[PDB]
Amino acid sequence: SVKLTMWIMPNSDTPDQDLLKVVKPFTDANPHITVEPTVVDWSAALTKITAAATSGEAPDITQVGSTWTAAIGAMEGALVELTGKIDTSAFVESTLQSAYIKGTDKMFGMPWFTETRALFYRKDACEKAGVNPETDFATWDKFKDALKKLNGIEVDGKKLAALGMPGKNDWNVVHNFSWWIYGAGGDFVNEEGTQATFSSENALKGIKFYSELAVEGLMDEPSLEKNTSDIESAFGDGAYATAFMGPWVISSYTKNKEENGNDLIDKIGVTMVPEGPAGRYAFMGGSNLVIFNSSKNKDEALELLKFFASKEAQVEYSKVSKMLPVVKAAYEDPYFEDSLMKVFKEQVDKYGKHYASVPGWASAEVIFSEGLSKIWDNVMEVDGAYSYDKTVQIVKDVESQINQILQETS
């Protein structure tokens, strides 16, 4: 018999058991294959995977952050090339980009699940404030006008901040700026993926618009010291009129109502991110699966990957992980078509934009995160008055470092 070993990151409440429940139909139907998952923490995962690819001491399969696929796939002899082995027509088209090395036709990962961030809002706050969510969040300028009407609005005796979002003490620093940069007509790197474009006029327009929401008082100031999970919890206890969050919060708030009677879930809606001057783009994240070239059972490894891309496994794993499926047929399930979830379905499909899938991306993201962290410090005036010129200098200094990374990894 064949024991497939698989590394996963912590995607659900009980990672190993939840994965094994989803694969039980596969191992029941293929009794000569067993699946042995091992959990690897997110912070050290890329380090451990890179070391396994280099040393040939690897599991058969590992989850990767979708942005890591090119980094690992570019390592000589690291991964099984999947080009032509997966039916790509099954996948939401926007999710496939991260599975390839950009500029090549080489597919080294299979998309597994995805996520995007949407704009959640308090319906009761909007009615009280005179905000119509069917129109007033559609564009940057309308959104900001709505925030002005919502900031400090009192609902059931509690004063709400207009927008709750984390600052630099967080793991989504870059991801939360991404769609502002895109909507302004900017990007982190050029289309070819070979030059940084983070200091363009358009990128700065997006960075300035989003970060100065803090200078203008429209963001909850205490929350800028906190992280994503804190903003999700606080919104779920009614602290903010709006917040940009992933789809997993719907389950959390639904559970809060079932267990504690917390009716926040009945007072919220969700809409797509506001369109910027250049159009509507949204963040895309998530994870892919890869097969190590050192695997002694690649045929069985591939069969497992294809199982994870089957409709039933996509539905079931997305439910338990609270992520979004990457296969089109999974969105036929009513779960992904309810009033809130359907906004996420539409956004990832029609407007999702993934970071360039280049081998240097993972290294570049750390640099972008450091720079945007300094921009938060700047707008929050932690060390002197806010200076937009300081943001410009930070972004130019980032641009230089990114170009050196791209030159090394070309």
Residue numbers in the entry: 49 to 458
Task: Quote the study's own text.
Clostridium thermocellum has extensive potential in lignocellulose biorefineries as an environmentally prominent, thermophilic, cellulolytic bacterium. Previously, five putative sugar transporters, denoted A to D and L and belonging to the ABC transport systems group, were identified in the genome of C. thermocellum, and the solute-binding lipoproteins (SBP) of these ABC transporters were shown to bind different dextrins by isothermal titration calorimetry (ITC) assays. To gain insight into the structural mechanism of the transporter specificities, 11 crystal structures, both alone and in complex with appropriate saccharides, were solved for all 5 putative sugar-binding proteins, thus providing detailed specific interactions between the proteins and the corresponding saccharides. Combined genetic, biophysical, and structural studies have provided solid evidence that transporter A and transporter B are the major glucose and cellodextrin transporters, respectively, among the five potential sugar transporters in C. thermocellum.
Similar to the typical SBP fold, all of the Cbps adopted two-domain structures connected by three hinge regions, with the buried ligand-binding site between the two domains. The unliganded CbpB structure and the complex structures of CbpB with cellodextrins (G2 to G5) were determined to 1.70 to 2.00 Å resolution. A hinge motion was observed between the unliganded CbpB and its complexed structures, and the rigid body rotation angle was ~17°. CbpB showed high affinities for all of the tested cellodextrins (G2 to G5), with the highest affinity for cellotetraose (KD = 0.562 μM). Surprisingly, the growth phenotypes of these mutants indicated that transporter B is the sole cellodextrin transporter, whereas transporter A is the sole glucose transporter.
